[PDB]
Design a protein around this nucleic acid. Structure first.
Ligand SMILES: [Zn+2]
Ligand SMILES: [Zn+2]
Ligand SMILES: [Zn+2]
Lengths: 511, 50, 93, 96, 214, 64, 49, 48, 102
RNA sequence: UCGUUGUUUUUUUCUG
């Protein structure tokens, strides 16, 4: 449903008629795994036969199509592919069938499943770990660089939970070098770093009093005000939304010829989208983006003032793990986009001749099926033609040398930090690892440390909807940012949900 | 200041006055300061009239 | 073709004295004629004064004395002051 | 000679073409192609692109790790094995 | 007398903008149809004539006077490389782009299609229309040993022999002519109807076997 | 300081690519665009943050 | 017979052992050269001497 | 453990560089110490 | 798509059998002739696919003597030679048939 | 009737 429509147009002239071809996606239907023998016979699958015959324990996927047409002058179940089904999962045959029949089915009651089967091999997915998204982190740079403190953040949608884009602020210059401490923010789809006040004005707050209201919340802390003053001075060349936006889009990484008319619109788009998308992507909410930018810059300078230790990257509380779910999600998304593009291209090349497409020769189930099979079989995580620059070794053969090894192999983790440049921070055991990952277990050699095994009582969050949290908070005096004032609200308590500020509360203890 | 007018803080081009002075058959050589003085005097007279 | 004039320079001088004052084309031509005739007069005076002292080159002092000779007391004095100030500024900077 | 670029045997009968064989054959095709532009319409822009293409295959067949430029690949997508790549590295001839 | 139509500065210029490989005729069709559909509107396509030549693959040429017209023509096409990698064409070069640019019976030609591909042959007769060209091939007959083909299992070649054909495995219409399975065998050489696309009359270097026999 | 720049900006009158030179002249906030084929001149004040692209956009707006 | 082994063998100075261990117990070969150009383009036919 | 794992590789690299630096020094019959070119490093190996 | 030998217009045979040559139906009668006539007059082989939207000032089409003919997909070169009957009829009809292969 | 030949390419988990 992420791409819930394909739309074509045809203002046919020879007699101007506007014909719009549409494809509407519908429900998905899933079946228990089955064989289609070359003899044409079919029957329910059971894993043992697969292990014996070098098969793939997979279930076909059926998607509901819909062909609707719009003409003006002025769909059924389709087999799209077979997804491998993890043993003992809800969709595996063996989740049922008692204990006795397992023996008939040639299955050890001890085996806990949790792995896929391909071409007779038993492949398992090793959980990868990545830095949490939608969080600010401040990092000090090295001595030989005008960059001193950087407060980066990566934005990813709550829905899907897929990486969207990032944005960085670079505390340029040194102490008593380059006049003041110039600050410039890097924006998506731009060809140069930009002064902060410029983007502030472009975002809606043209006057500097509002800017200093949002970024600062301790007036007596004169030092931060005066050391951010240099940025204020250099942004006086811009005084209204329009010139700021045009200045922004002028380096909008587009071609030459958009000129000012569409340049400000391009800037308005790139500020409505692609920037802090995890907050929102539509118009009428740049107040929230302003508030977030102010908070983030405030924190960045606080770390620049040494009033708080620079953020720890190894803090495990900021780490996130991705089990089979999210990973298969990403791979399926890529393959689904490929399939949709194929269907669209076939639509184009088959309606020019004006033939009612069968919807069947158009859909090549080999796309998703082949892609998933290859990705699990080889581990080169991605499209086959892009083997290079593709995360390798995500899926591994299930090592069945001894039952304990099998157990351990399943609760494995990993860090894709590469081995180019030795370093030590990622490898060393960290205090936050207490009771989440084993302290004693780890490989030897170059991988020492980068491979971690879940503690005996570990549990991974699968994600829950946040809406009820919002509903509850509002009941309990959650104050939206719109009613926020520095001098008044210098004692209230900010609230973040899933890494995004949502409002204010002045008595959070009872909350 | 690149252009000699900017070096002089005036508006009449010293370069054009100097160019015409070379093609004037008035003297063998032309100094670098006489055009500036002439430009300033002409500017003052023009401002007085205007 | 490339018949140079003093249109834009007179326009700039006018903008700095009376910024909101226009002009016609014939007034511009009259200004061009006045400026050209004054340029010719001062250059000729410099040439004659160089010839009288048998000096083959022109400095700023020749233009200064030519302006003194041409224009009367107060106007010549004011032109001398402006020329001296402009020349000194062009010299120091 | 073939010794320097022997024909691999993927599975018994079927023998694959060593990367050098593909690269040499491609350079041969390109060289023939340049020889065929002059005899017909060669509007100084087909000539330029085609000769640059020939230069490109020649350079790759001589070295395939030029900085700042994309890298020639096989239909498999794997980057080609230029002679320089052969010689350098631990696996290279000197150290291998 | 086409020479009277020599080009000059008067004729609108031409720009060659790179387009997606293999989809050049598709781009030509898009240009033509959008030009038809926008005609009479307030934003028409200001072009005169566009072409693509087989030799100039990946190159799209349109006759116009301003690069904006070319950009409009290519704008909105996914069958084109988005880059405006355009260039001009010289006055003498204009005719080159529109310049389009030996089959005789009795001369030896080769086959490149079917199960007899790679065998030199002599043309017997070119159809009156000019779509199928008869050839004089060498039969490749197993004499019914494996009748119960492909271009990878063809055994050695031999001239058709009436005696051997009668011994091992049929109709006679003339002296020396035998019709076998719809194929014509004259003096031991295979005659058959062949498509002109399956054969090439130029770029042939005779082989050692041909020298030994032919 | 005088800065020569044979940048690839497209001209509008001569319609020749890379015929546009965006010289940079920061002394008195003065911006010139020098063309090579039709040799037209565009003037525009340039602030501290001005860039050849800024002059190009100003010129484009001026042309229409 | 890795590099470090080569260096160890040098250390003891066992030249001839190192020579044979890298020719005879491994890829030995014979060739012919032209004493004028010093290349390896000689066309040798042994049975035709 | 990490310390040993890192240290071994760097020490090996240093060893390789050193060996490939001094692999041709040979004590000649005259008592001098010369590299391949015959350049003299020490007039008497270890001065004894 | 098959290219008319006279005007050079190339269209799929469906249009030829239904609506005839857009520019030579009056002299060739492609629509109301046996498929042999359509095939011979509209040869499959072609080169130089030219898209035309203007024909009045069409210098390119002016070379192809198709200024008076409606703009369309014009094949600069057409292989094969017309049967004797079609060429004789074209000559008799006052229409000068010049092969475009050269 | 001596003779008599058996892949590469990557990636992976391991051993000292
Ligand atoms: Zn120009
Ligand atoms: Zn020699
Ligand atoms: Zn026709």
């Amino acid at each position: 449903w992420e791409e819930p429509r394909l739309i074509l147009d045809q203002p046919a002239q020879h007699d101007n008629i506007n014909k719009r071809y549409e494809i509407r996606f519908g429900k998905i239907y899933l079946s228990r795994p089955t064989m289609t023998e070359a003899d044409g016979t079919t029957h329910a699958m059971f894993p043992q036969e697969a292990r014996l015959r070098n098969l793939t324990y997979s279930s076909p996927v059926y998607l509901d199509m819909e062909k609707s047409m719009f003409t003006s002058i002025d769909g059924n179940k389709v087999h799209i592919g077979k997804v491998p089904i993890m043993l003992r999962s809800k969709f595996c045959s063996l989740r049922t069938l008692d204990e006795v029949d397992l023996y008939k089915m040639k299955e050890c009651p001890y085996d806990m499943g949790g792995y896929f089967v391909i071409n007779g091999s038993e492949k398992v997915l090793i959980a990868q770990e990545r830095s949490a998204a939608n969080i600010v982190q401040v990092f000090k740079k090295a001595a030989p660089s005008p960059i001193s403190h950087v407060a980066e953040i990566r934005s990813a949608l709550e829905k899907g939970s897929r990486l969207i884009s990032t944005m960085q602020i670079k505390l340029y210059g040194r102490e008593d070098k380059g006049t003041g401490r110039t600050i410039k923010a890097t924006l998506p789809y731009v060809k140069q770093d930009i002064p902060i006040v410029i983007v502030f004005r472009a975002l809606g707050v043209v006057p500097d009093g509002e800017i200093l209201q949002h970024i600062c919340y301790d007036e007596n802390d004169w030092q931060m005000l005066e050391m951010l003053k240099p940025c204020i001075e250099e942004g006086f060349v811009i005084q209204d939304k329009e010139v700021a936006l045009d200045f922004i889009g002028r380096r909008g990484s587009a071609a030459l010829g958009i000129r000012r008319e569409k340049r400000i619109q391009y800037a308005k788009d790139i500020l409505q989208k692609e920037l802090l998308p995890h907050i929102t992507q539509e118009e009428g909410f740049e107040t929230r983006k302003t508030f977030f930018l102010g908070y983030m810059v405030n924190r960045l300078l606080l770390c620049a003032l040494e009033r708080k230790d620079q953020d720890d990257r190894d803090h495990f509380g900021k780490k996130r793990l991705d089990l089979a779910g999210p990973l298969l999600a990403n791979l399926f998304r890529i393959l689904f986009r490929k399939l949709t593009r194929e269907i669209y291209r076939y639509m184009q090349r088959c309606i020019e001749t004006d033939r009612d497409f069968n919807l069947n020769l158009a859909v090549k189930s080999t796309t998703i099926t082949s892609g998933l099979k290859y990705s699990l079989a080889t581990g080169n995580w991605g499209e086959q033609k892009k083997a290079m620059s593709s995360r390798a070794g995500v899926s591994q053969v299930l090592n069945r040398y001894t039952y304990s090894s099998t157990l351990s192999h399943l609760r494995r983790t990993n860090t894709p930090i590469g081995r180019d440049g030795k370093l030590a921070k990622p490898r060393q055991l960290h205090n936050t690892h207490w009771g989440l990952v084993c302290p004693a277990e780890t490989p030897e050699g170059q991988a020492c440390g980068l491979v971690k095994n879940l503690s005996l009582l570990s549990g991974i969050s699968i994600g829950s909807p946040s809406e009820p949290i919002i509903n509850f908070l509002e009941e309990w005096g959650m104050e939206p940012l719109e009613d926020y004032d520095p001098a008044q609200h210098t004692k209230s308590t900010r609230i973040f949900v899933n890494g995004v500020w949502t409002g204010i509360h002045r008595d959070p203890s009872m909350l | 200041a690149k252009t000699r007018s900017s070096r002089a803080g005036l508006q009449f081009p010293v370069g054009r006055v100097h160019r015409l002075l070379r093609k004037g058959n008035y003297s063998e050589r032309v100094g670098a300061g006489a055009p500036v003085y002439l430009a300033a005097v002409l500017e003052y007279l023009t401002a007085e009239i205007l | 073709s490339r018949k140079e004039s003093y249109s834009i320079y007179v326009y700039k001088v006018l903008k700095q004295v009376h910024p909101d004052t226009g002009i016609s084309s014939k007034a511009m031509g009259i200004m061009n004629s006045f400026v050209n005739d004054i340029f010719e007069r001062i250059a000729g005076e410099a040439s004659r004064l160089a010839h009288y002292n048998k000096r083959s080159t022109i400095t700023s002092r020749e233009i200064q004395t030519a302006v003194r000779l041409l224009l009367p007391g107060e106007l010549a004095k004011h032109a001398v002051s402006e020329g001296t100030k402009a020349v000194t500024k062009y010299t120091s900077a | 000679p073939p010794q320097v670029r022997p024909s691999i045997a993927m599975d018994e009968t079927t023998q694959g073409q060593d990367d050098l064989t593909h690269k040499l054959s491609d350079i041969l095709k390109a060289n023939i192609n340049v020889q065929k532009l002059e005899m017909d319409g060669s509007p100084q822009h087909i000539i330029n692109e085609v000769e640059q293409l020939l230069q490109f295959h020649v350079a790759t067949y001589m070295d395939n790790d030029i900085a700042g430029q994309p890298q020639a690949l096989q239909k498999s997508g794997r980057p080609v094995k230029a002679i320089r790549a052969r010689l350098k590295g631990k696996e290279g001839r000197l150290r291998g | 007398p086409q020479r009277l139509l020599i080009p000059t500065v008067d004729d609108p210029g031409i720009w060659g903008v790179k387009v997606r490989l293999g989809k050049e005729k598709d781009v030509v069709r898009q240009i033509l149809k959008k030009k038809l559909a926008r005609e009479g509107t307030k934003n028409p396509l200001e072009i005169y004539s566009a072409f693509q030549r087989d030799s100039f693959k990946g190159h799209v040429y349109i006759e116009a006077r301003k690069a904006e017209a070319i950009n409009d023509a290519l704008k909105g096409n996914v069958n084109v490389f988005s880059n405006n990698s355009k260039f001009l064409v010289g006055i003498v070069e204009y005719k080159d782009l529109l310049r389009p640019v030996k089959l005789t019976r009795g001369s030896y030609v080769r086959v490149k299609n079917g199960k007899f591909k790679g065998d030199l042959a002599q043309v017997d007769e070119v159809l009156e229309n000019g779509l199928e060209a008869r050839l004089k091939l060498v039969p490749r007959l197993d004499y019914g040993k494996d009748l119960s083909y492909t271009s990878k299992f063809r055994p050695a070649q031999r001239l058709f022999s009436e005696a051997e054909a009668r011994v091992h495995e049929i109709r006679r219409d003339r002296d020396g002519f035998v019709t076998y399975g719809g194929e014509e065998y004259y003096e031991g050489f295979l005659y058959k109807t062949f498509r002109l696309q399956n054969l090439i009359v130029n770029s042939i270097n005779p082989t050692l076997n041909e020298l030994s026999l032919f | 300081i005088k800065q020569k720049l044979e940048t690839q900006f497209t001209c509008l009158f001569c319609n020749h690519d890379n015929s546009v030179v965006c010289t940079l002249d920061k002394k008195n906030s003065i911006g010139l665009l020098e063309c090579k084929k039709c040799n037209l001149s565009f003037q525009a004040p340039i602030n501290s943050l001005s860039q050849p692209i800024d002059i190009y956009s100003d010129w484009i707006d001026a042309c229409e | 017979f890795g590099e470090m082994e080569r260096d160890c063998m040098i250390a003891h100075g066992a030249a001839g052992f190192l020579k044979e261990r890298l020719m005879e117990a491994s890829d030995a070969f014979r060739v012919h050269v032209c004493g004028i150009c010093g290349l390896m383009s000689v066309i040798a036919n042994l049975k035709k001497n | 453990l990490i310390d040993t794992a890192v240290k071994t590789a760097e020490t090996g690299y240093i060893q390789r560089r050193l060996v490939k630096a001094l692999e041709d020094i040979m004590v000649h019959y005259d008592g001098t110490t010369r590299n391949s070119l015959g350049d003299i490093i020490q007039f008497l190996y270890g001065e004894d | 798509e098959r290219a008319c030998m006279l005007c050079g217009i190339v269209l799929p045979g469906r249009v030829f059998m239904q609506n005839g040559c857009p520019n030579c139906d009056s002299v060739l009668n492609l629509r109301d002739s046996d498929q042999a006539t359509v095939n011979e007059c509209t040869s499959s082989s072609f080169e130089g696919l030219v898209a035309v939207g203007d024909n009045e000032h069409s210098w390119v089409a002016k070379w192809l003597r198709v200024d008076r003919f409606q703009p369309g997909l014009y094949a600069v070169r057409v292989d094969g030679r017309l049967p004797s009957d079609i060429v004789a009829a074209l000559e008799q009809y006052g229409v000068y048939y010049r092969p475009r292969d050269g």
